[PDB]
Design a binder for this molecule. Structure first.
Ligand SMILES: *[C@H]1O[C@H](CO)[C@@H](O[C@@H]2O[C@H](CO)[C@@H](O)[C@H](O)[C@H]2NC(C)=O)[C@H](O)[C@H]1NC(C)=O
Ligand SMILES: *[C@H]1O[C@H](CO)[C@@H](O[C@@H]2O[C@H](CO)[C@@H](O)[C@H](O)[C@H]2NC(C)=O)[C@H](O)[C@H]1NC(C)=O
Ligand SMILES: [Cu+2]
Lengths: 329, 329
């Protein structure tokens, strides 16, 4: 800050914050902040009177938040909850003084993915983040977007201190699969949009956060219909045939080995091909889906979605397809 | 009687009644009653004006009631109906004169299990049975509770008239199974409670019989959750792992051979292990369960049970779990 704004400031601040992210920061201001600040002494910066801050401390305190240098999926109901607590502080800042402070204070003792994930969503949705452009995920946390080989090649570059660029590969045994329409899935661009798309309109949004995203519902319907078409075309251009729809009662015919690795975490598990779906402990039962899919499918077939009271809310009308997306994603 | 009560009377009467039960009685009063009485000549003893008596005679008459010396399960919709007709006579007696009469008259030409079963429930629920303690099932009809070997050993004792006690065994090839947590299932005590529990609050009760059992519903929820925990603990103490929940789409992995025999009836059938469930003629289809289980499971999931009119009766409240038990057992 300029005990405020700029943007080539706001901006600077951000680049510092997501610089070497798997290691304590090297930018000194970020550290005395990191040390000196107390998110709890002038609940005023906070439009909540700092209930959000006060909740994260509580957890950082009982030290019940996920550890640093460990992995993180946004599909973990707790990891998510923790990542999203950071979003609610950064969210209720009146100005840069409260953001930098917090993403500095926190950056330094909350885990990286919760952190990477909170800083981005926050920058994207909060009032205070206008001027900024976020660096591309692919360069901030490259392990999610580069291969496993280039990663190891880069680890060696570093061991030996001799530089240089390595050329990446493509997945399976090209000329042996349908890792022929790979160029599409594996692109750092689509992978970027896919993540952004869902940071722009998150599945977890409540309108307490501030405004309402408009038709995420159709927006969900549509974005995916697009990747599914866009995908189906590439498979056309490759003498391949449109894709199979998946069912829970059948084998997952087509499995792959991703060859990708986590930074802290191990390599991504692989899937053998012609496998039978198993009931996965913790998440949900396979049949649990099969019934979900029917409750779904009956709302489409009935003409109405029925809520909690047994109210039937009609969907044979234009808002239709969006109440369906709210129930389906 | 004392042309009534006592209890060391009521009581006596009962012990006479369930004495050698697979054979006509040897206590003379029980027999001239047995012969001389007519449940139909002083409809007055009866608070029904003897519609109950009058219904059993009707059936004993067309001789359409189950035969004597034959088996009986309480799961047979007719056997049950016949056993429960005895309960409704014994039920509407104004005094001992009507009970002894009937369980004497009947004891002697209705089948034993319908009889054993009616005398007990009747003694347990009817107004007139206060003073009594019932003998333990295990000694009145030992075939349901002792092994097949001890039974045959006792048959020999008898053939030869040389007495004595035999030591019973435990089931499969102990040190070969999970007939290691046998001591629990096979105990004459738990087996006694299990039967009593369901005689105290029967699945067939209507409140016409006289009063309402209070929360059989939660009472059902709970009693079984208890045997299931109590069981799960014993399997802990045996290096065994908590039990598998059963599904209709899977094999019944764990089968057993009971080695038990009926008195009149043959030995209990056995089950081979890793078998596939078959649709059993007469009872119901396997899928018939699979849908039942979903109708169930949707009431839980919806928030309401829906009756016959399509009334939704809410269950997200404290009486909750008991309307669920009324629909589930
Ligand atoms: C990776 O593919 C690139 C294409 O960008 C190759 O880099 C080339 O290096 C060759 C040496 O044979 C030069 O003739 C080209 O001018 C290079 N281009 C940049 C059109 O560097 C590279 O050879 C591949 N392999 C490494 C086996 O980097
Ligand atoms: C059944 O087990 C009992 C344990 O109650 C055994 O009865 C015992 O008989 C032995 C003879 O070896 C005596 O030493 C014990 O005093 C008995 N106890 C009653 C502690 O009788 C019996 O041996 C077993 N078998 C029959 C192979 O009855
Ligand atoms: Cu039971």
């Amino acid at each position: 800050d300029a005990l405020g704004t700029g943007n080539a400031q706001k901006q600077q601040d951000i680049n510092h914050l997501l610089d070497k992210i798997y290691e304590p920061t090297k930018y000194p201001d970020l550290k005395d902040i990191a040390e000196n600040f107390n998110p709890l002494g002038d609940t005023s910066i906070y439009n909540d009177h700092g209930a959000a801050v006060e909740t994260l401390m509580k957890e950082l305190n009982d030290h019940r938040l996920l550890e640093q240098r460990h992995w993180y999926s946004l599909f973990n109901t707790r990891q998510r909850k923790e990542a999203l607590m950071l979003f609610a502080v950064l969210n209720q800042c009146k100005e840069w003084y409260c953001f930098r402070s917090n993403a500095a204070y926190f950056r330094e003792r909350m885990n990286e993915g919760e952190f990477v994930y909170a800083l981005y969503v926050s920058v994207i949705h909060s009032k205070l983040g206008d001027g900024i452009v976020l660096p591309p995920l692919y360069q901030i946390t490259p392990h999610m977007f580069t291969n496993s080989e280039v990663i190891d090649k880069a680890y060696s570059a570093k061991m030996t201190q001799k530089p240089g660029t390595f050329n990446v590969s493509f997945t399976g045994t090209k000329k042996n699969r349908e890792q022929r329409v790979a160029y599409f899935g594996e692109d750092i661009g689509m992978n970027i949009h896919h993540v952004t798309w869902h940071m722009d309109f998150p599945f977890w949004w409540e309108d307490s956060y501030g405004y309402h995203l408009d038709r995420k519902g159709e927006l969900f319907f549509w974005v995916h219909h697009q990747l599914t078409a866009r995908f189906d075309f590439e498979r056309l251009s490759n003498w391949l045939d449109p894709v199979d729809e998946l069912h829970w009662d059948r084998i997952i015919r087509e499995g792959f080995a991703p060859l990708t690795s986590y930074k802290y975490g191990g390599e991504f598990p692989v899937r053998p091909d012609n496998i039978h779906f198993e009931d996965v402990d913790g998440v949900a039962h396979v049949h649990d889906l099969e019934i979900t899919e029917s409750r779904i499918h009956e709302a489409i077939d009935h003409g109405y979605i029925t809520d909690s009271d047994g109210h039937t809310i009609d969907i044979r009308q234009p808002k239709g397809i969006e109440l369906l997306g709210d129930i389906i994603e």
